[PDB]
Enzyme design. Structure first.
Site, PDB file in Angstrom:
ATOM      1  N   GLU A   1      10.573 -10.243  -2.443  1.00 43.38           N
ATOM      2  CA  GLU A   1      11.524  -9.100  -2.465  1.00 43.38           C
ATOM      3  C   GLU A   1      12.969  -9.614  -2.462  1.00 43.38           C
ATOM      4  O   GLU A   1      13.807  -8.945  -3.062  1.00 43.38           O
ATOM      5  CB  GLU A   1      11.275  -8.155  -1.289  1.00 43.38           C
ATOM      6  CG  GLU A   1       9.936  -7.448  -1.368  1.00 43.38           C
ATOM      7  CD  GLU A   1       8.785  -8.154  -0.682  1.00 43.38           C
ATOM      8  OE1 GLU A   1       8.921  -9.407  -0.374  1.00 43.38           O
ATOM      9  OE2 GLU A   1       7.718  -7.521  -0.560  1.00 43.38           O
TER      10      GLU A   1
ATOM     11  N   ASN B   1      21.657 -33.629  -7.651  1.00 46.67           N
ATOM     12  CA  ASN B   1      22.555 -34.623  -7.015  1.00 46.67           C
ATOM     13  C   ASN B   1      22.044 -34.960  -5.612  1.00 46.67           C
ATOM     14  O   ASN B   1      22.846 -35.407  -4.803  1.00 46.67           O
ATOM     15  CB  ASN B   1      24.014 -34.156  -6.986  1.00 46.67           C
ATOM     16  CG  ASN B   1      24.210 -32.770  -6.428  1.00 46.67           C
ATOM     17  OD1 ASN B   1      23.328 -32.248  -5.734  1.00 46.67           O
ATOM     18  ND2 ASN B   1      25.373 -32.182  -6.726  1.00 46.67           N
TER      19      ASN B   1
ATOM     20  N   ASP C   1      20.270 -28.307  -7.193  1.00 49.70           N
ATOM     21  CA  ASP C   1      18.947 -28.620  -6.584  1.00 49.70           C
ATOM     22  C   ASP C   1      18.770 -27.840  -5.271  1.00 49.70           C
ATOM     23  O   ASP C   1      17.679 -27.290  -5.083  1.00 49.70           O
ATOM     24  CB  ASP C   1      18.745 -30.118  -6.426  1.00 49.70           C
ATOM     25  CG  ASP C   1      19.844 -30.866  -5.684  1.00 49.70           C
ATOM     26  OD1 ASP C   1      20.991 -30.338  -5.556  1.00 49.70           O
ATOM     27  OD2 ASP C   1      19.552 -31.997  -5.253  1.00 49.70           O
TER      28      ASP C   1
ATOM     29  N   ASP D   1       0.867  -1.210   0.000  1.00 48.02           N
ATOM     30  CA  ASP D   1       0.000   0.000   0.000  1.00 48.02           C
ATOM     31  C   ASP D   1       0.886   1.237   0.000  1.00 48.02           C
ATOM     32  O   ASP D   1       0.485   2.189  -0.668  1.00 48.02           O
ATOM     33  CB  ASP D   1      -1.069  -0.013   1.092  1.00 48.02           C
ATOM     34  CG  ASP D   1      -0.548   0.042   2.516  1.00 48.02           C
ATOM     35  OD1 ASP D   1       0.477  -0.604   2.804  1.00 48.02           O
ATOM     36  OD2 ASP D   1      -1.184   0.736   3.338  1.00 48.02           O
TER      37      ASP D   1
ATOM     38  N   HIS E   1       0.917  -0.781  10.238  1.00 41.45           N
ATOM     39  CA  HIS E   1       1.423  -2.071   9.703  1.00 41.45           C
ATOM     40  C   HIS E   1       2.843  -1.866   9.163  1.00 41.45           C
ATOM     41  O   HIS E   1       3.141  -0.780   8.636  1.00 41.45           O
ATOM     42  CB  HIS E   1       0.436  -2.666   8.681  1.00 41.45           C
ATOM     43  CG  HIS E   1       0.205  -1.812   7.489  1.00 41.45           C
ATOM     44  ND1 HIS E   1      -0.745  -0.784   7.476  1.00 41.45           N
ATOM     45  CD2 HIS E   1       0.761  -1.840   6.255  1.00 41.45           C
ATOM     46  CE1 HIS E   1      -0.756  -0.225   6.277  1.00 41.45           C
ATOM     47  NE2 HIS E   1       0.157  -0.855   5.517  1.00 41.45           N
ATOM     48  N   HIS E   2       3.689  -2.887   9.331  1.00 44.98           N
ATOM     49  CA  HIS E   2       5.112  -2.919   8.923  1.00 44.98           C
ATOM     50  C   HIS E   2       5.988  -2.027   9.816  1.00 44.98           C
ATOM     51  O   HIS E   2       7.049  -1.619   9.366  1.00 44.98           O
ATOM     52  CB  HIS E   2       5.307  -2.558   7.437  1.00 44.98           C
ATOM     53  CG  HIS E   2       4.380  -3.198   6.469  1.00 44.98           C
ATOM     54  ND1 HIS E   2       3.733  -4.396   6.720  1.00 44.98           N
ATOM     55  CD2 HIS E   2       4.042  -2.843   5.205  1.00 44.98           C
ATOM     56  CE1 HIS E   2       3.015  -4.720   5.654  1.00 44.98           C
ATOM     57  NE2 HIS E   2       3.175  -3.793   4.735  1.00 44.98           N
TER      58      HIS E   2
ATOM     59  N   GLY F   1      28.324 -15.086  -2.100  1.00 43.55           N
ATOM     60  CA  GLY F   1      28.078 -16.543  -2.108  1.00 43.55           C
ATOM     61  C   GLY F   1      26.723 -16.936  -1.554  1.00 43.55           C
ATOM     62  O   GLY F   1      26.681 -17.904  -0.817  1.00 43.55           O
TER      63      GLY F   1
ATOM     64  N   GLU G   1      28.558 -28.999   0.476  1.00 45.70           N
ATOM     65  CA  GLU G   1      28.569 -29.125   1.966  1.00 45.70           C
ATOM     66  C   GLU G   1      29.050 -30.531   2.346  1.00 45.70           C
ATOM     67  O   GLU G   1      29.873 -30.634   3.260  1.00 45.70           O
ATOM     68  CB  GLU G   1      27.212 -28.813   2.602  1.00 45.70           C
ATOM     69  CG  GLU G   1      26.651 -27.457   2.220  1.00 45.70           C
ATOM     70  CD  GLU G   1      27.489 -26.262   2.635  1.00 45.70           C
ATOM     71  OE1 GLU G   1      27.189 -25.704   3.695  1.00 45.70           O
ATOM     72  OE2 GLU G   1      28.405 -25.876   1.871  1.00 45.70           O
TER      73      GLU G   1
ATOM     74  N   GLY H   1      20.841 -33.298  -2.950  1.00 45.16           N
ATOM     75  CA  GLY H   1      21.206 -32.498  -1.762  1.00 45.16           C
ATOM     76  C   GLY H   1      22.422 -31.625  -1.978  1.00 45.16           C
ATOM     77  O   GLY H   1      22.703 -31.212  -3.115  1.00 45.16           O
TER      78      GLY H   1
HETATM   79  C1  LIG Z   1       6.580  -9.143   2.357  1.00 43.95           C
HETATM   80  C2  LIG Z   1       5.448  -8.275   1.918  1.00 43.95           C
HETATM   81  N1  LIG Z   1       5.532  -7.724   0.703  1.00 43.95           N
HETATM   82  C3  LIG Z   1       4.498  -6.950   0.311  1.00 43.95           C
HETATM   83  C4  LIG Z   1       3.387  -6.705   1.085  1.00 43.95           C
HETATM   84  C5  LIG Z   1       2.218  -5.860   0.602  1.00 43.95           C
HETATM   85  N2  LIG Z   1       0.949  -6.627   0.537  1.00 43.95           N
HETATM   86  C6  LIG Z   1       0.110  -6.692   1.571  1.00 43.95           C
HETATM   87  S1  LIG Z   1      -1.305  -7.631   1.222  1.00 43.95           S
HETATM   88  C7  LIG Z   1      -0.641  -8.023  -0.323  1.00 43.95           C
HETATM   89  C8  LIG Z   1      -1.364  -8.936  -1.268  1.00 43.95           C
HETATM   90  C9  LIG Z   1      -1.871 -10.227  -0.694  1.00 43.95           C
HETATM   91  O1  LIG Z   1      -2.482 -10.893  -1.821  1.00 43.95           O
HETATM   92  P1  LIG Z   1      -3.157 -12.327  -1.665  1.00 43.95           P
HETATM   93  O2  LIG Z   1      -2.297 -13.129  -0.724  1.00 43.95           O
HETATM   94  O3  LIG Z   1      -3.479 -12.847  -3.021  1.00 43.95           O
HETATM   95  O4  LIG Z   1      -4.454 -11.971  -0.817  1.00 43.95           O
HETATM   96  P2  LIG Z   1      -5.954 -11.653  -1.357  1.00 43.95           P
HETATM   97  O5  LIG Z   1      -5.922 -11.679  -2.882  1.00 43.95           O
HETATM   98  O6  LIG Z   1      -6.882 -12.741  -0.766  1.00 43.95           O
HETATM   99  O7  LIG Z   1      -6.366 -10.326  -0.788  1.00 43.95           O
HETATM  100  C10 LIG Z   1       0.528  -7.379  -0.563  1.00 43.95           C
HETATM  101  C11 LIG Z   1       1.294  -7.425  -1.843  1.00 43.95           C
HETATM  102  C12 LIG Z   1       3.405  -7.301   2.362  1.00 43.95           C
HETATM  103  N3  LIG Z   1       2.397  -7.098   3.237  1.00 43.95           N
HETATM  104  N4  LIG Z   1       4.416  -8.116   2.750  1.00 43.95           N
HETATM  105  C1  LIG Z   2      21.654 -18.154   1.506  1.00 39.85           C
HETATM  106  C2  LIG Z   2      22.641 -19.236   1.799  1.00 39.85           C
HETATM  107  N1  LIG Z   2      22.327 -20.154   2.712  1.00 39.85           N
HETATM  108  C3  LIG Z   2      23.217 -21.141   2.937  1.00 39.85           C
HETATM  109  C4  LIG Z   2      24.445 -21.198   2.316  1.00 39.85           C
HETATM  110  C5  LIG Z   2      25.466 -22.288   2.585  1.00 39.85           C
HETATM  111  N2  LIG Z   2      25.721 -23.154   1.407  1.00 39.85           N
HETATM  112  C6  LIG Z   2      26.848 -23.041   0.640  1.00 39.85           C
HETATM  113  S1  LIG Z   2      26.752 -24.062  -0.790  1.00 39.85           S
HETATM  114  C7  LIG Z   2      25.361 -24.831  -0.129  1.00 39.85           C
HETATM  115  C8  LIG Z   2      24.763 -26.035  -0.810  1.00 39.85           C
HETATM  116  C9  LIG Z   2      24.379 -25.801  -2.263  1.00 39.85           C
HETATM  117  O1  LIG Z   2      23.873 -27.071  -2.756  1.00 39.85           O
HETATM  118  P1  LIG Z   2      23.465 -27.238  -4.299  1.00 39.85           P
HETATM  119  O2  LIG Z   2      22.907 -25.963  -4.835  1.00 39.85           O
HETATM  120  O3  LIG Z   2      22.637 -28.467  -4.279  1.00 39.85           O
HETATM  121  O4  LIG Z   2      24.910 -27.489  -4.935  1.00 39.85           O
HETATM  122  P2  LIG Z   2      25.759 -28.809  -5.189  1.00 39.85           P
HETATM  123  O5  LIG Z   2      24.978 -29.979  -4.641  1.00 39.85           O
HETATM  124  O6  LIG Z   2      25.844 -28.838  -6.711  1.00 39.85           O
HETATM  125  O7  LIG Z   2      27.087 -28.638  -4.530  1.00 39.85           O
HETATM  126  C10 LIG Z   2      24.938 -24.253   1.033  1.00 39.85           C
HETATM  127  C11 LIG Z   2      23.781 -24.725   1.867  1.00 39.85           C
HETATM  128  C12 LIG Z   2      24.708 -20.142   1.422  1.00 39.85           C
HETATM  129  N3  LIG Z   2      25.864 -20.076   0.752  1.00 39.85           N
HETATM  130  N4  LIG Z   2      23.795 -19.214   1.130  1.00 39.85           N
HETATM  131 MG   LIG Z   3      22.929 -30.326  -5.016  1.00 38.57          MG
END
Ligand SMILES: Cc1ncc(C[n+]2csc(CCOP(=O)(O)OP(=O)(O)O)c2C)c(N)n1
Ligand SMILES: Cc1ncc(C[n+]2csc(CCOP(=O)(O)OP(=O)(O)O)c2C)c(N)n1
Ligand SMILES: [Mg+2]
Ligand SMILES: [Mg+2]
Lengths: 543, 539
Positions: free
Chosen positions: A49, A451, A424, A26, A112-113, A397, A457, A453
Site C-alpha cells: 500500500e 554507490n 541504491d 476482505d 481484524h485490522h 523527500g 547522508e 550506500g
Molecule cells: C497490509 C495488508 N494489506 C492487505 C491485507 C488483506 N489480506 C489479508 S490475507 C491477504 C492475502 C495473503 O496472501 P498469501 O500471503 O499469498 O497467503 P495464502 O495464498 O497462503 O492464503 C490479503 C491481501 C492485509 N491483511 N494486510
Molecule cells: C522514507 C525516508 N527514510 C529516510 C530518509 C532519509 N534519507 C535522505 S536521502 C537518504 C539516502 C539515499 O541514498 P541513495 O538513494 O543511495 O542516494 P545517494 O547514495 O545517490 O545519495 C536517506 C536515508 C528519507 N528521506 N526518506
Molecule cells: Mg546510494
C-alpha cells in the site's frame, strides 16, 4: 444494478482517472468487482500500500487526478506516508478505504485490522492533517459526501479520503445529475499584474509545484511563449513550464543557482510568482533573495500584492486569465547559454560527468524522475528538451517514492519515455513494484546509482559510519528474480563514460522494452551542488 | 560529555534492548553516532521503516522490549502501521523520531519532511490513538519525559513515542542513579482460589497479554503445579508451554477440534488471563464462553462473573497465582505419526508434516493466509514459541518480525511460514538477513496469489492474482550464495520431509524453501473460516 460504488467510480472517471492502484482485502473485494467490471477503468494491483500511494501520486502528477484502494486499518496506515507526500506537494489523490459493514462497526465488534476497542474512527482521525477532506459514507449520505470530498479535491488539488463500508458500497444509488466579491477581486488582481508587467523593464516569472497540481503547465507555456517573459522555476515544481522555451533561464536554487541566472532573478524590477513554496531543498537552504516589495505571488490558498495579503480569488481561472492579458511583450535580453558537447572517454563514471552526459543525451517527449540523493541534486538543474516533464519530491523527500511514482506516471502517459534516476539506498525501500512493471509491460528506462550506500547522508554526517552502509544487492539481476525475461527487461552494468553513453542511447533507441541499468559510482563522489548542499544541511542541523 | 541521547540509550539498555532497528536520516545521524559508539547495543539498519517497525515488534515478542529509530515525517509515517500493530497486540516497542533543531521548529521553517506550514506537531498528534504515551523532548524536560514514557511502556507494555530534536539529543544530561520502577488484588485472588477449589471441570484460557509481559514461564509453572486444563486462542498462542499434559490445544470457537470444543464449553468455571476475543481467534464469534461462570483478567480491566473490576496490577496478580494453595485438578483431559509419499504437497498434509517434524526450542512464525490457519492449531514441542498477528493481521509483518525475533534469541531456530502474496510486501529485509548472517528456516507458500482472499470472495477474479516472482532466485539477487542461504523448491511430501529435516540439521545457514501448492488448496480450517469471513461482510 447501480450502487454507491458505481457512483464513486463514475465520479473518478469524470476526474480523468483510468487506472486504480492499491491492495485488496476482505473489506474491499466486493467493491473491487465493480472496478474489474468497468470497461473504462483498470485495476492495477500493487505489492504493498505504501507503493500504491506513491504510484497514485506519480500518476496524479501526469494524469492530474489519481485514486488508490486500501483495506481498513492495515492498508490505509501503510499508505499514510504516501498520502502525506501528496498533501505536502499538493497532488489530487483519492484514497478509498474499504471498511467493515455498518452492522459490525455499530456493534463495536473486535474484528481484524482494529485495536479490539470497537472504535472504527481512529484511522480517519489520524488522516486529518494530511487530507483536505475526509468522509465515512452511509447509505443515506453517500452521494452528497462523495461529491463534497471530490469537490474539495477539485478546489484544492490536495488528497482526500473516502471510508467505504462493504454494505454502503453495495447500497442502491442514482447516477449523478450534476458535474463536480471574488470575480471582481480576480479582475483587480489581473489588472494589477497586467499594469506591473506593462511597466516592468526586467520582470521575472517564477512558477512552482501548484501549477503542476492544477495541470496548468501548457497554459503557463502558452503565456510565456506569447509574452516572451523571462521565467525560472524552483526544483520544487520543475517542468511547471516548458524548459525548451527561449525565455526559460534555468532552475533558481538560492546561492546554488548558476551565477547569470542568480544575477537576473535577484535584480528583476518585478517578480510574478505562481504556485511557488520556498523550501530548504528548493532555496539553497533559504539563501534566496526574492523581494516581496516588488512581487505579486499567487498560491491556491492565498496571494500577496506587493506585501499585502489577498484571500478571495480562484487560482486556476486567474492563471488561465493570464492568456487574455494584451499589450504584454518583453523586449529585453535573457542570459548566456553555453551547453558543451559531451565527449566520453573510458574514464570511471563520476557524478559531474554523469549529469553532463544525461543533459546532453535526454530527448524530447521524456519524463525525468529523480530520487532524493545524488540523483535529485545532479538531475534537477538539467535543461529539458521540448514536450518533456520532471518528477521530484524535494519538500516531502521520501526516499523510494520515485520508483512506484515513475511507474504510475509512465502508466498515466504511455507516449512520454520515463527515465528514472534512483539511488541504491532508495530502491531498497520500494523494489517490489518491479513485479507490477513486468506485468504491465511498461517500458521505462531505470538507472540505479550503485554507490554502495547513502552518499547524500555521508555528505551531511558520518561519511565512514556503518549506518550509511546498506546490504549490496546484485541490482542488474533483480528483473530475472522478479520474473522478467530479456524480451521484457534489458539489464546492463555501466562502469565508464563510454559505456554510459552507449547504454543510454541503446535504451532510448528501444522504446519496446524496459531498461534496468546499474551505474557504478564511488561512495565518496557527489555532484558539485550536493558538495555545498550537504554542508548547508549539516549547518541547519547544528546542535 | 554524557548527553540526553546517552540517557535514553542507558534506559533502553535497562529494558533489555541490545539491538536498535530503523532507517537513518539527517535529523537522526548525530544521535545514531551514540548507538554506534555503545559496546552493549547494535544498530541494525533496515531497508525501510515499515519493515523496521515490524522487525521491532517481532523483537519485542521474544526480548520483551524493543526500539527503532526513524526520521521526522517520512520515517515515522512509513512506520505507523507497524506501531498500530504493536498497539493492537500490546507489544512494548519504543519509536524514537529524530526531528529538526528546536531553532528550526521554533522559527516554523519550510524544511524537508514537513507540509511547509511551519507545524512540527502534526505527526506526534497522529500517533495519539496508537501509543500509550508520547513526548517531544526539550533540554529542560528530557530526563523526566524519557522516564515518563518508558514508565508507561513498563506499566502497559504498549508502544510509546519519543520525538528527539537534534540539539536536544546533544544536550547535557546526568546518568540515572536508579533504574526505572491491593485489597482489590487480594479480592480477585480470593475469588479465583474459591472458584478453582469448588470447580469439577475448570478451564484456564491464556492470551496475548501474557506474552506482552513475558509471563509465559509463570503461567507454565502455575499449570504444571495445579494440573489445570488449559487452552489458548490463536491470539496469544504459546502463552503457555503447549507440551504440558493439561494443554488441550487451540480453542477457535466452532472450528476447534471437537473433544477440545466439548471440554471448554462444558467447563463449570472459566479463568481467562490476558485474552481478547476477536473474529480470527473465535471462529468468527462462534465461541461459547458463559460470562456467568467466568473470571477474566486483562491489563486494563477484569470481570468477576459479569461484574467489572478496575484497580489491580495484572503482572503481580498473574505471579500471585503461584501462591494459591489447595488447587489441584484430579480429572481427565482429552485424547491428544506422519508417513510421507511421493504425492504432491497438499495444505492439510503440509501442516501434519510440520506438527510431526517441529523440534523443541523452535519459534514458529505464521503469516495471515493459509500459513496462519494451517500452523496455529499445531501442538508445539517443549520450550517453543509462536508468533502470529490475528488481530492486527497486516500481511508482510511476519517476514521482518521473524528476523527481529531470531535476532532477539539466536538460540531458538525460527521457522517462518509466509505466503507468496505476503512476502511481496516486505521482501527487502532479505538484505538485512544476509548481512546479519542469521539462520532462520523460511518457507514461502507459492500458491500463485492470495488463496485466503480467493476463499472469501472472487476466487477467479484477477485482483487475487500477483506477479509470479522467481522466489528461489531472490537470495542470489540480494547477495547471498549457497554458503549463506540454501535455496530449495519442494513439490512432494517426500521432498518436504527431506528438506525440513535438512534445514533443521544445518543451524549454520539460512534456508529459503519455495513450497508449491495449488491456488485452490486451503487447510481444512480455512475452507470453513473463509465463508464465515464472507458472511461477516455480507452486504
Ligand atoms: C497490509 C495488508 N494489506 C492487505 C491485507 C488483506 N489480506 C489479508 S490475507 C491477504 C492475502 C495473503 O496472501 P498469501 O500471503 O499469498 O497467503 P495464502 O495464498 O497462503 O492464503 C490479503 C491481501 C492485509 N491483511 N494486510
Ligand atoms: C522514507 C525516508 N527514510 C529516510 C530518509 C532519509 N534519507 C535522505 S536521502 C537518504 C539516502 C539515499 O541514498 P541513495 O538513494 O543511495 O542516494 P545517494 O547514495 O545517490 O545519495 C536517506 C536515508 C528519507 N528521506 N526518506
Ligand atoms: Mg546510494
Ligand atoms: Mg498465496
Amino acid at each position: 444494478m447501480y450502487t454507491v460504488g458505481d457512483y464513486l467510480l463514475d465520479r473518478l472517471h469524470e476526474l480523468g482517472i483510468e487506472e486504480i492502484f492499491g491492495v485488496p482485502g476482505d473489506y474491499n473485494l466486493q467493491f473491487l468487482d465493480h472496478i474489474i467490471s468497468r470497461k473504462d477503468m483498470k485495476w492495477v494491483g500493487n505489492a504493498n500500500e505504501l507503493n500504491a500511494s506513491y504510484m497514485a501520486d506519480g500518476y496524479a502528477r501526469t494524469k492530474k487526478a489519481a485514486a488508490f484502494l486500501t483495506t481498513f486499518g492495515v492498508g490505509e496506515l501503510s499508505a499514510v506516508n504516501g498520502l502525506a507526500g501528496s498533501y505536502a506537494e499538493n497532488l489530487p489523490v483519492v484514497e478509498i478505504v474499504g471498511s467493515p459493514t455498518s452492522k459490525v462497526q455499530n456493534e463495536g465488534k473486535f474484528v481484524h485490522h482494529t485495536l479490539a476497542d470497537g472504535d472504527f474512527k481512529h484511522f480517519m482521525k489520524m488522516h486529518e492533517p494530511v487530507t483536505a477532506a475526509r468522509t465515512l459514507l452511509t447509505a443515506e449520505n453517500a452521494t452528497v459526501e462523495i461529491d463534497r470530498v471530490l469537490s474539495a479535491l477539485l478546489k484544492e488539488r490536495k488528497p482526500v479520503y473516502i471510508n467505504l463500508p462493504v454494505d454502503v458500497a453495495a447500497a442502491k444509488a442514482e447516477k449523478p445529475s450534476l458535474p463536480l466579491t471574488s470575480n471582481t477581486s480576480d479582475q483587480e488582481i489581473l489588472n494589477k499584474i497586467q499594469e506591473s508587467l506593462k511597466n516592468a523593464k526586467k520582470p521575472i516569472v517564477i512558477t512552482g509545484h501548484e501549477i503542476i497540481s492544477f495541470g496548468l503547465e501548457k497554459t503557463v507555456s502558452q503565456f510565456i511563449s506569447k509574452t516572451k517573459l523571462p521565467i525560472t522555476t524552483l526544483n520544487f515544481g520543475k517542468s511547471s513550464v516548458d524548459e525548451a522555451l527561449p525565455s526559460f533561464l534555468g532552475i533558481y536554487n538560492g546561492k546554488l543557482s548558476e551565477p547569470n541566472l542568480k544575477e537576473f532573478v535577484e535584480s528583476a524590477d518585478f517578480i510574478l510568482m505562481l504556485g511557488v513554496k520556498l523550501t530548504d531543498s528548493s532555496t539553497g537552504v533559504f539563501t534566496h533573495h526574492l523581494n516581496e516589495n516588488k512581487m505579486i505571488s499567487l498560491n491556491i490558498d492565498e496571494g500577496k500584492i506587493f506585501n499585502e495579503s489577498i484571500q478571495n480569488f480562484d487560482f486556476e481561472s486567474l492563471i488561465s486569465s493570464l492568456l487574455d492579458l494584451s499589450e504584454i511583450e518583453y523586449k529585453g535580453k535573457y542570459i548566456d547559454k553555453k551547453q558543451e558537447d559531451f565527449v566520453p572517454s573510458n574514464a570511471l563514471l563520476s557524478q559531474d560527468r554523469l549529469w553532463q552526459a544525461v543533459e546532453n543525451l535526454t530527448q524530447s517527449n521524456e519524463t525525468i524522475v529523480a530520487e532524493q540523493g545524488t540523483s535529485f541534486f545532479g538531475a534537477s538543474p538539467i535543461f529539458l528538451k521540448p514536450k518533456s516533464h520532471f518528477i521530484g519530491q524535494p519538500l516531502w523527500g521520501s526516499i523510494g517514492y520515485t520508483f512506484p511514482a515513475a511507474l504510475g506516471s509512465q502508466i498515466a502517459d504511455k507516449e512520454s519515455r520515463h527515465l528514472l534516476f534512483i539511488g541504491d539506498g532508495s530502491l531498497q525501500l520500494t523494489v517490489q513494484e518491479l513485479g507490477l512493471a513486468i506485468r504491465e509491460k511498461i517500458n521505462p528506462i531505470c538507472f540505479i546509482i550503485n554507490n554502495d550506500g547513502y552518499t547524500v547522508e555521508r555528505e551531511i554526517h558520518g561519511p565512514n559510519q556503518s549506518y550509511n552502509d546498506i546490504p549490496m544487492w546484485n541490482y542488474s539481476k533483480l528483473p530475472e528474480s522478479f520474473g522478467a525475461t530479456e524480451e521484457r527487461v534489458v539489464s546492463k552494468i555501466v562502469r565508464t563514460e563510454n559505456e554510459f553513453v552507449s547504454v543510454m542511447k541503446e535504451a532510448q533507441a528501444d522504446p519496446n522494452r524496459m531498461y534496468w541499468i546499474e551505474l557504478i559510482l564511488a561512495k565518496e563522489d557527489a555532484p558539485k551542488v550536493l558538495k555545498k548542499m550537504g554542508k548547508l544541511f549539516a549547518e541547519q542541523n547544528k546542535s
